[PDB]
């Protein structure tokens, strides 16, 4: 859960979330929590797809850039039909580009609140090191 | 008495000293040469310096057994002595009794 309904409302205003989330009432009246939850879950799943090879999956903290990316992807997911030239689609593409840059080691995952994220041990591995005759015998 | 002057008692000569130590005769060598590293060898030598000669003795036995060149050299050196003729001589300007004892 890198973003919440509060984050979506704050980033896109409550009116737009209501309009793109209420599918049964015309005009919209309330925000459907289930739809928003599914959209946020899908955004988190995509982000994990991008970040699985460099960091641990169950992150204990959410970096701020991760919050922005999740909010953007979740909003893009709340559109049933999304054309290519829709600006929301372009924002989603830019965020996906940021994610790909992070995955390819060109961008670093920033601070969460004060501490660093938790990188995986992929680079750590070395055989073991056989150096007998060099132990001050 | 002996050469060192320690009192000698003929009572203790009837049985070997180690007879009352039947535990020793049942022991088996631990073979410390297998899986030996320079650190292990240094520890073995240092411990031997401090009075733990068991590990050092077993290591020396393994070393003798596992090296053909060293074993050949030691065997040649010892066989050199084993082939020497020997004799018992009386002390300097010994007397008739000393000559008979010799």
User: A137 at the B interface (CB within 8 A)?
Assistant: yes
Task: Give A63→chain B minimum CA distance, Å.
Answer: 48
Nearest chain B residue (CA) to A133: B38
Tokens of A18: 């209501």
Instruction: Give the closest residue to A7 by CA, choosing from A64, A63, A71, A59.
Output: A71
Provide the terminal-to-terminal Cα distance of chain A, rounded to the nearest Å.
Answer: 55
Cβ contact A135–B41 (<8 Å) = no
User: B38 at the A interface (CB within 8 A)?
Assistant: yes
User: B12 at the A interface (CB within 8 A)?
Assistant: no
Round to whole Å and give the CA distance between B48 and A82. Answer: 82
Q: What is the CA radius of gyration of chain A?
A: 20
User: A132 at the B interface (CB within 8 A)?
Assistant: yes
Residue with token string 């015309």: A26
Cβ contact B41–A137 (<8 Å) = yes
User: A133 at the B interface (CB within 8 A)?
Assistant: yes
Verify cis geometry, omega within 30 degrees of 0, for the bond prior to A27.
yes
Q: Is B59 helix (H, G, I), strand (E, B) or coil?
A: helix
User: A135 at the B interface (CB within 8 A)?
Assistant: yes
Is the four-CA dihedral A70, A73, A75, A77 of positive or negative sign? negative
The DSSP secondary-structure symbol of B78 reads H
Q: Is B52 helix (H, G, I), strand (E, B) or coil?
A: coil
Instruction: Give the closest residue to B45 by CA, choosing from B58, B35, B55.
Output: B55
- Full DSSP string of A72-113: HHHHHHT-SS--TT-HHHHHHHHHHHHHHHHHTTSS----SS
User: A130 at the B interface (CB within 8 A)?
Assistant: no
Contact list in B for residue A137 (CB cut-off 8 A) is 38-39, 41-42
**Are residues A61 and A112 in contact, defined by beta-carbon separation less than 8 angstroms?**
yes
Residue with token string 């003798």: B64
Task: Give B58→chain A minimum CA distance, Å.
Answer: 20
| Resolution rounded to one decimal, in angstroms | 3.1
Burial annotation A29-66 (CB, 10 A radius, 16+ → b, else e): eebbeebbeebbebbbebbeebbeebbeeebeebbebb
Residue with token string 């005009």: A27
Cβ contact A132–B37 (<8 Å) = yes
Contact list in A for residue B39 (CB cut-off 8 A) is 132, 135, 137
Cβ contact B42–A132 (<8 Å) = no
Round to whole Å and give the CA distance between A40 and A77. Answer: 8
Contact list in B for residue A132 (CB cut-off 8 A) is 37-39
Round to whole Å and give the CA distance between B35 and B29. Answer: 15
């Amino acid at each position: 859960s890198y973003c919440t309904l509060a984050d979506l409302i704050e980033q896109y205003s409550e009116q737009k979330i209501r309009e793109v989330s209420d599918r049964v009432n015309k005009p919209a009246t309330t925000i459907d929590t289930v739809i928003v939850d599914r959209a946020i879950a899908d955004a988190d799943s995509e982000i994990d797809l991008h970040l699985h090879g460099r960091y641990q999956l169950p992150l204990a903290s959410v970096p701020t850039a991760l919050k922005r990316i999740a909010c953007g992807l979740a909003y893009a997911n709340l559109h049933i039909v999304l054309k290519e030239e829709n600006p929301v689609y372009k924002t989603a593409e830019h965020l996906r580009k940021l994610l790909s840059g992070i995955a390819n080691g060109k961008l670093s995952l920033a601070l969460d609140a004060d501490g660093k994220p938790a990188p995986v041990a992929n680079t750590v591995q070395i055989s073991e090191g056989r150096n007998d005759w060099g132990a001050d015998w | 008495v002996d050469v060192y002057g320690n009192p000698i008692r003929t009572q203790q000569l009837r049985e070997p000293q180690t007879s009352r130590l039947a535990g020793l005769a049942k022991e088996f060598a631990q073979h410390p040469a297998k899986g030996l590293t320079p650190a292990k060898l240094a520890r073995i030598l240092v411990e031997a310096e401090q009075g733990n000669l068991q590990a050092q003795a077993e290591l020396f036995m393994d070393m003798e057994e596992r090296d053909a060149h060293l074993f050949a050299e030691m065997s040649k050196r010892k066989r050199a002595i084993l082939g020497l003729d020997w004799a018992v001589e009386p002390p300097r300007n010994a007397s008739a009794a000393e000559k008979a004892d010799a």
